[PDB]
Write the structure tokens for this entry.
Amino acid sequence: INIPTLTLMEEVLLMGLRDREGYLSFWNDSISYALRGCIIIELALRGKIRILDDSARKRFDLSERLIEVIDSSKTGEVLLDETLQLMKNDEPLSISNWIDLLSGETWNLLKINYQLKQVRERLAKGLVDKGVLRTEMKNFFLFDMATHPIADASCKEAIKRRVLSVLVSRNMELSYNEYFPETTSFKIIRTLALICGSYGANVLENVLTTLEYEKRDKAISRAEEIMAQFSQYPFDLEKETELGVSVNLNKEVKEEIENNPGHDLQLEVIAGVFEVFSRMDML
Amino acid sequence: NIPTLTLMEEVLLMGLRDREGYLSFWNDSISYALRGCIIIELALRGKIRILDDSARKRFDLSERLIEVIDSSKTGEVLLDETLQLMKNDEPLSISNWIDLLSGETWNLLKINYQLKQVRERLAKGLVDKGVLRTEMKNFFLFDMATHPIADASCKEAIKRRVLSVLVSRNMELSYNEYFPETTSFKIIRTLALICGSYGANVLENVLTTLEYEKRDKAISRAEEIMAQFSQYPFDLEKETELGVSVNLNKEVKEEIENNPGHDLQLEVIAGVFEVFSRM
Amino acid sequence: NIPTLTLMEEVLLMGLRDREGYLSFWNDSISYALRGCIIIELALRGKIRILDDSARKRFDLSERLIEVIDSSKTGEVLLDETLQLMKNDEPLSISNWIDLLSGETWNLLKINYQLKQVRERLAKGLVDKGVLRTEMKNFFLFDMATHPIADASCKEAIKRRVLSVLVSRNMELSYNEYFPETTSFKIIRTLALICGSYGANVLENVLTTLEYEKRDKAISRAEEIMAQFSQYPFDLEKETELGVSVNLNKEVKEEIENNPGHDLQLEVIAGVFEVFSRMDM
Amino acid sequence: INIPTLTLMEEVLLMGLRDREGYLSFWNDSISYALRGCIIIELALRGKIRILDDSARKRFDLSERLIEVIDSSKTGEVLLDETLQLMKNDEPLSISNWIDLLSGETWNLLKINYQLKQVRERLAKGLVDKGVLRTEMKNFFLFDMATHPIADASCKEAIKRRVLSVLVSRNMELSYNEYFPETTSFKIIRTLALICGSYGANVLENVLTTLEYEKRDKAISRAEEIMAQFSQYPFDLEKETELGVSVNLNKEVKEEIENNPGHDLQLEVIAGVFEVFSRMD
């Protein structure tokens, strides 16, 4: 009711999905990794984790700070739940340390089973069961493959429109649908999450390509600004943009945080993940 | 005595490009024709024969009943699966068998023995025999087993055999590991390929590079041989105005003479040829 | 009047991201599609033509043989290399060539026919033409040359063409230094961009921002064109019920009425377009 | 026989990568400078150089002392061999001097192709030849590129373990492997050399990021101590650590030198480089 229908993991997949012949969409070591960022961002907004409140942490990069489990009760998201399981039964590890373990970018034989298998297909069963995707068989010469064509095109359309509202509107005014109601906690935070996630996942640009290039360039930049601003805690909400895009982002984000108080330890985790998204070139 | 690939496998190959991917989308023309192949194959392996009544003659070839001669395993899954059903049943006609195994007739009591998972099972066959290999392609929302081809010469052999029968004026089939010199009914088997792969509509797939006059002559040579060999006894008297295959008669007469007392089998293979032309 | 980029260049550009282009999606589809482009290009340049034997008409366009009518160097390494191959071989079919040039065939005496270094040479092209600069990015154990984009207006103009055919009620193409109102078969070349692009699965790339209905309409209009022009002579009399580029027919007809004499060349084009159609396989 | 598979400079470079693919570091002047130090520490350790046995030296900082080539026979290690070759055919220079020369920080008109170049690339080839990573072609959208993901992942774990064994655990029990056998001479010095090389190079923190905060800090301090300690000669194996980490160091190092006798002219050089490591800004 305050948690929206789709997980950020799902939204990013959609940002990657083609309209026609979607199994032929581009899958790569980037999207895969960024979905793990997402898993942790998500768990943060859901109040399951927070950074460990040790003032020592302030001497270390945001992405290297340890986090702890506030709350280990099932979310109903299989992907989230399973990582929550791993987290419950272990010492506090750092954000990138978790993102790495869950992606198996890490190489200690000790924590082999920490890596999440079947993300794409479980993410797609989710998209199917939620009605965003259909399921139909295409018969190739030697086999049939299950195909998951878009069932509801209006779903991704709103995702896209939220991005556009933040990266091309001069004034961010966000549209709410059944999937993403006005009564959604941290709605802008979550939109900024989706953008940065998509950016790291290397699918942000997909959503802008029809625009004239000045507008596409500006958008990319805007995202990069947002990524700077929100990849440090407390968020700099004072650096007004020189770009003339979402000129109201600071006022609204401020208000959003104001109305949603005493959550900094969770908002910090997010700047952490946002930091990780910045350093994704290094894969 | 027995070749490595079953005709069913040979026809499947005929549907694929030389490397990865395919030519025909898997339609149910090919699917039916493959069943025909099983029945010929069974007849060639001396497992089945045309029911040795003379009352059979009041009826077209494909309306004639077959009787299990020999129910011992073949080693080929699809083949054995059909032998299974056949041993446990009335003598049924060629036509009917083909229909039942394709599931293009309807029978209430006959517990439904359309052959499921054919194409996918033939695939496995072809992997296990080293024709096809298995490649893991990562797609956006799942992973996928794929089978691009492993041994290209296998297809060359088949192509060359086919073109030996329908472009060159003198047939001299060539032999290899898969299809050795010592194979029983060598020529009847490549005719069966040609005829099967014709109703399957995959025959043209090998003609695609030939000079245009050769393409027409091959296509019409095919249907020529395709009616010679769908009546019984086989007409090995009538020769051809086309400049192809001109020794096929001599050579089939000689192939049969050397392999005596199988008439009750060839007749089945003929009746299957009949279903091919009728499709 | 031959425009500045090859159709292969334009296809590559359709698949090229704005930032970190070197991480754009590469794959067998775009790769094979580049070859069909080569053939189209050659027919558009008077270098090849359909082998003028009526026996052909009993068969599919894509399987009709083509012949070298003018083997003089073209000035494009890729086009030219394939002209050398063609010049000194017997007549071979449209799909047979694309197969040979794409590596797609297991033929003994012709493994050497495969054009290697195609991407590299193509970026060389887009550099020497000023669409792409060239700049070193430093990783840890090495440095790689990247070619970020120098002139964004190039892909833009291409994009605006596709959009003019695929979303405007009335197509009205626009010209630039690269693609002048001067140029031969302006519309065919466009339809070629589109159909080639679609075969490469890089068509929908440019339509992403559009409202989902306009987008969906755009793809199926693209499919109309695909069938319309993958038979010869072109079906220029069947009109469209999507109410988009409703004048395409009138305009192609005019484009063909002016510039007569290349019947045997246009056919090659329709042949390649047929290959484009069968690309799922 | 008693010299290990990897050079410290391979090991320092290895500290620079992420476990499977990717990097933790953008290449830079620090890692570069340190690797030259490494070349020396190594050349000393191999009985290829001593300090020049002169009294005047004691009036001079360890790094401004001259070094003498006691032998110049090929090491098999290509960077060592080239710098050995420069050293052979030259007058004794300060250790600090060579590092500068070798990394091209100073300029000498008599000696202007003295800087080791194509370091990275040669270093990786080594690492590939030795089995410690492999080589995958990646097919980006405009070119091919040869990359080098880790092959043997345990090699780099062995190392993290050693470093960690002296900078984090209370007692120190070095854990030996196929790459770094128990029979390798100056087992513990080299471990220390790595720790110091790493530090100068700014890749030491990379092995530490996963730990608890106290552990991270204590590790860094302990490495700084170790550095202070072994940048003077003879080593103060008397100074005791109040950090409660790696408390058996002295005893073991003592025991270690007490097992390699008559190598003081070498070991001194080592201190001379440790001194250079801790003067990088």
About this structure: Chain A has one domain: 1-283.
